């Protein structure tokens, strides 16, 4: 019930997709390069403990009565829950500490896209920690404590709780459904396809930024779903939008969910057709997103949707082109991008002496 | 992953074991046609029946006539019942309508003002409530979603709260959960098996004076925010002084085990347990059933966080009202703030597949 924290790559990218998610973006408040590398090493030290199910530092209790506990404790006696912890570096981070010439080109700023309604507050970030586990309380505990450890050095800019499937009740040999009611993930890069990952996800040494070798580039979008609207369309409209039938997830005309799609059979603005790599010169992404529901608004409407997360070897040749191709997507009627960030995701923590970002600092 | 049984003398989601996730929604009625509303009630009851047993509402999520939108939104498809439960309540404001005034029970008292109170009126009150709990949040969401969709026009959603993890227990035999302050929360609650405790402190009785409420129970909801920043920089001793138990095991102060009976005069005069305990309140006993929430950041660089506190009792005036009044000197106050309020009468359980929600009031 745990995922090895060390390795060539960071866990949480090609490893099994866990049930829950706490994504937080942080802004750096120090300009001390030393202070920062110090926190990086501290943060790594605590990541090792949390991914193995231990409290941070000297535990949640049993210390000097007069000190505050090292660990806030609400993970006591829960299991590691396959917790993974992925840290990434926003572009604005490279304006500090004199790293401006270390910024990888593939960490390209997103264009503004048609329809964009980017909420500036829930956008961007100097760095991020993706926290995945099957128990949401573990994930949150992780973020809470990491915030606490870097307090005075970093602050939480925005935070996003999500969920996918509940592995306690659904088969992993079965495709999860998003809040629009369709199966989601059918044509994705899978953690087993090492050659796919090497070609489309991991950064190569010869890519141009040696410190990113084995890292990846992450694109995040908070995507609101106009639910009450979508719910009023007919089954045929809905099935028309993506190009798959709702109940079985089959590409129009075909019988099974995993039949290869025949795209001409799909309406020319169908999602699957416009996202498909054959539509995009080969561009193929690893999608690792979670649905979200934050509650209601002032208008009565469900505040729900897809927290879309994509990993790629180069933002320019991965997300950018595919997002460009969805200008005309039929889905646009029912969604709206309302927050966004990119991050270079450094390679793994190689052993117990390594630390997060060592290749950079 | 089983199903919880929907029919009964009482509604599920109360004495039932606490499921992991919560999705709570408060509804306001927008129609004045009482037949229209009674029709709603019957149709919601029929929907709930399908939903708690793992089925699509209506004709299903697909395979209907293509030109028409599907009966079920379809995102529970392939998911188990997941111990889903649907509990409905009636807010005080509902009796102003449909000539239901004279039936509003005495035990649905409005709450007085409490010092500290900072209540957002947008996220307070409500004509009625659906409490949906489930071990899968997708299942929880799906139920609220489809109930609202069916009710389009006759009701709208005033506000909602998702609880991402439980901080209550109705089963003292399974481990007690921790709230976001780090302490076990649930130890001395009321258990779903103590049937006589349930009757004396939770179920409404005929003799209690409003006959349609027999087999029911009244519900208080407080949205309580936690100043975790403040709390996270207090000493371990201060934290333990605040409640009167220790953080590691959750034992009353001095004693060695979580379930040992607390000895109240070893605790500080203002410790939370010492003040909340029934002996300090004439025996007032609550069935706590709350969940934790976190809603983004607070915009000041910290995580928003708190506890959606839910309490069930036979009479608000002899339950929440005295305990909360006694908490006016609780040491815990310096770390929390009440920011949302709302009470509800919860009717008795649907007896069978002919009965319907509120059939006893209507
Ligand atoms: C609410 C927003 C979105 C929804 C509901 C959605 C839904 C879906 C669905 C149902 C499928 C078919 C099954 C599958 O996952 O293979 C799909 C495929 C796909 N989507 Fe999305 N998507 C959304 C946003 C995006 C974005 C922002 C991108 C890229 C920038 C994207 C790219 C893709 C790709 C690459 C595929 C695989 C296409 C294939 O090879 O068949 N989607 N999506
Ligand atoms: C964030 C808000 C609150 C927190 C964190 C909290 C925390 C706790 C904790 C840790 C316990 C340990 C004992 C147990 O669960 O058996 C407890 C007990 C209790 N709390 Fe609270 N509490 C909160 C608010 C309230 C409120 C608002 C009430 C009533 C209005 C209340 C009434 C009680 C009662 C009656 C007990 C157990 C009494 C007994 O049988 O000993 N609590 N609470």
From TrEMBL, chain A:
Binds 1 heme b (iron(II)-protoporphyrin IX) group non-covalently per subunit. It comes from the Bacteria. It is an enzyme of class 1 (oxidoreductase). The keyword Cell membrane does not apply. Its cofactor is heme b. GO terms for biological process: iron import into cell. InterPro entries: Dimeric_a/b-barrel, Dyp_perox_C, Dyp_perox_N, Dyp_peroxidase, EfeB/EfeN, TAT_signal. It is found in: Cell envelope. It catalyses: heme b + 2 H(+) = protoporphyrin IX + Fe(2+). One of its GO terms (molecular function) is ferrochelatase activity. Residues 10-163 form the Dyp-type peroxidase N-terminal domain. Residues 175-349 form the Dyp-type peroxidase C-terminal domain. Heme b binds at residues 185-187, 271, 287, 308. Its EC number is 1.11.1.-. One of its GO terms (cellular component) is cell envelope. Keywords: Heme, Iron, Lyase, Metal-binding, Oxidoreductase, Peroxidase, Signal. The keyword Transcription regulation does not apply. Pfam families: Dyp_perox_C (PF20628), Dyp_perox_N (PF04261). NCBIfam families: Dyp_perox_fam (TIGR01413), tat_substr_1 (TIGR01412). Belongs to the DyP-type peroxidase family. Involved in the recovery of exogenous heme iron. Extracts iron from heme while preserving the protoporphyrin ring intact. This is Deferrochelatase. It comes from Streptomyces coelicolor (strain ATCC BAA-471 / A3(2) / M145).
TrEMBL record, chain B:
Its EC number is 1.11.1.-. It catalyses: heme b + 2 H(+) = protoporphyrin IX + Fe(2+). Residues 11-164 form the Dyp-type peroxidase N-terminal domain. It comes from the Bacteria. Binds 1 heme b (iron(II)-protoporphyrin IX) group non-covalently per subunit. Heme b binds at residues 186-188, 272, 288, 309. Residues 176-350 form the Dyp-type peroxidase C-terminal domain. GO terms for biological process: iron import into cell. One of its GO terms (cellular component) is cytosol. Keywords: Heme, Iron, Lyase, Metal-binding, Oxidoreductase, Peroxidase, Signal. Pfam families: Dyp_perox_C, Dyp_perox_N. It is an enzyme of class 1 (oxidoreductase). It is found in: Cell envelope. InterPro entries: Dimeric_a/b-barrel, Dyp_perox_C, Dyp_perox_N, Dyp_peroxidase, EfeB/EfeN, TAT_signal. Its main location: other. One of its GO terms (molecular function) is ferrochelatase activity. Its cofactor is heme b. Involved in the recovery of exogenous heme iron. Extracts iron from heme while preserving the protoporphyrin ring intact. Belongs to the DyP-type peroxidase family. PANTHER family: DEFERROCHELATASE, DEFERROCHELATASE/PEROXIDASE. This is Deferrochelatase. The lineage of its organism: Bacteria, Bacillati, Actinomycetota, Actinomycetes, Kitasatosporales.
